Design a protein around this ligand. Structure first.
Ligand SMILES: Cc1ccc2cncc(NC(=O)Cc3cccc(Cl)c3)c2c1
Ligand SMILES: [Cl-]
Lengths: 298, 302
């Protein structure tokens, strides 16, 4: 029993964190095989022009107490790829994956190439992450673990004025309409990840929290009409299908749980909590719920 | 033990019934807080009924045209507005007997209790199900318009139906409490017919599980079925398709009795083919479809 916001074990990723210094700027890099990936803003904008003025020895890369020697440099979108002489012996089996909003991932927050903490995030529908970052966290990565393979899905680049965070996939493509420069940028109006709230309601049912259940059901269209009024993401037939296993395990049809959510949105919790929360939690995907309520290991 | 068609206690709803009179028309209204909800056709003169322009008829009305009576007390109407096919009469007194309530729109197959009223006075309570053709097989006479359908799960009354009309087959049509009709019906005297009705398959299976919980297994068999083969057979007996949602909903009953849903489906398939052969199931010689899976669990267990 119990339901916690749980991150993947960070060990395979910790062995990849290095410190990248370029001039006065110090941030984090991800050392995989003989390449160090880091935000291109470490050179700071005309990034092609700033990069052409740099030499390999301008980038000081530090892996623990060992200084790596940079033998090449190239830019792929908003990520800098520093070719190093040494292949990381701790390189795990990995993939670079781009995630969709609503998907969750773990973030290994680092400062000076050293991991300080790990937390679980969700890519918000407005493509920002409500992370926890201080100055020096740039280059901290977001990942998932698929059996023994680390899927890198995020690299931290910046903080928006609202305290939320923006970054890219590992191919340097930003999540959201953000750019890596000092200019007026704002996170768009956020919405609630509906499929995730339903997944979390199923987790609450599995943990014995059933007060919110009711005898009612709803049409998918009637629910989307209601959900649109509360700034909730539309629930698609894909989401309903994804929720299938949880629906089968608890005996509560997806549209049945949707009617519980409809009443919760119009009536609130009425002094009650669900999984120790007085708010509807949207940062657990249907897969996160199944994995935590089954015990999958890495 | 025992399985009865059980209605919710009507007390919380009785304290909300008021009489609404507009001209020659008298029907029932539901007094919740300082609002009286009733069918908008109370403003019609029966000569309007065929093609009524409700916006046009309502604009010609004043607050003092609507006489609202709560017991022996005449309530004062201080405002009026129309929301779909329901009239909302703002009154100068909040109902002190207003219970904790919600307005819920139900899906076909769902059940609810009906508090039948005449002249703002409750005369009886019965259990009903929203038919797959969106009609209800109620028991209503003239003057029952405005009688409400509800469920009382826990201490909150969930209003799901307001009676508006009787179709030519003796079945009834009405709306949710936001004035949206169930089915393709309109509050007009025009030619309207209930579509071909079908048996609520998930409810019959729930009722077969209730029979098993009550000690009856005569109808069970050694067979199982695929969901698709059950639906092919069920369609031929005018039964609603059973979806994966229904199979999932039947999960708890299947777990409690040790009989898999598709196993129980094979038993229903056999009953459809053979009939009962002079036998009964829960005192009925017909397959009962007005108990949902939720009704069976509430009544048989708690
Ligand atoms: C005579 C009678 C008998 C039983 C009845 C049972 N329920 C309702 C009655 N009346 C109506 O249906 C009034 C009506 C007519 C046309 C359109 C609308 Cl929206 C309403 C009943 C009347
Ligand atoms: Cl329903």
């Amino acid at each position: 029993s119990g339901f916690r916001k749980m991150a993947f074990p960070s060990g395979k990723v910790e062995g990849c964190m290095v410190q990248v210094t370029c001039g006065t700027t110090t941030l984090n890099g991800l050392w995989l095989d003989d390449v160090v990936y880091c935000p291109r803003h470490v050179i700071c904008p005309n990034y092609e022009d700033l990069l052409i003025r740099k030499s390999n020895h301008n980038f000081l890369v530090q892996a623990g107490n060992v200084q790596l020697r940079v033998i090449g440099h190239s830019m792929q979108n908003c990520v800098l790829k520093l070719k190093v002489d040494t292949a990381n012996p701790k390189t795990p089996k990995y993939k670079f994956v781009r995630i969709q909003p609503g998907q969750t991932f773990s973030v290994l927050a680092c400062y000076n190439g050293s991991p300080s903490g790990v937390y679980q995030c969700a890519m918000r529908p407005n493509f920002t992450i409500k992370g926890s970052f201080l100055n020096g966290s740039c280059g901290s990565v977001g990942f998932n673990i698929d059996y023994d393979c680390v899927s890198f899905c995020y690299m931290h680049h910046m903080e928006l004025p609202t305290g939320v965070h923006a970054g890219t996939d590992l191919e340097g493509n930003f999540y959201g309409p953000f750019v890596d420069r000092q200019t007026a940028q704002a996170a768009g109006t956020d919405t609630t990840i509906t499929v995730n709230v339903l997944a979390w309601l199923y987790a609450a049912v599995i943990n014995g929290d059933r007060w919110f259940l009711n005898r009612f059901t709803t049409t998918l269209n009637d629910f989307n009409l209601v959900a649109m009024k509360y700034n909730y993401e539309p629930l698609t037939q894909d989401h309903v299908d994804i929720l299938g296993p949880l629906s089968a395990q608890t005996g509560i049809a997806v549209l049945d749980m949707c009617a519980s959510l409809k009443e919760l949105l119009q009536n609130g919790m009425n002094g009650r909590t669900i999984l120790g929360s007085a708010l509807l939690e949207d940062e657990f995907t249907p897969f996160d719920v199944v994995r935590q309520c089954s015990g999958v290991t890495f």
